[PDB]
Amino acid sequence: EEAELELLRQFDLAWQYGPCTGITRLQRWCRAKQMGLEPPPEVWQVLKTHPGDPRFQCSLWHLYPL
């Protein structure tokens, strides 16, 4: 923790995985894996050792009335 919260914030702004501020984080991870762009096997291995926490399993701007 506090290092796992920057890896996800770095996965969320890389443009080669998609334009993602409307959906979940694991849905975008599996969308890129289907098309197989290059999802890395570390943004998966922190979404498995946690429960349904809203500060891991949510996009950066999931507040913010946009």
């Binding site: 443009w15 334009p19 009335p65 946009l66």
Partner: peptide, 19 residues
């Protein structure tokens, strides 16, 4: 047409009519 919209312009009728 390929990236997210971020515009919470309080003087635009577009904002909060799209909400």
């Amino acid at each position: 047409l390929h990236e997210d919209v971020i515009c919470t312009s309080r003087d635009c009728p577009i904002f909060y009519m799209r909400k």
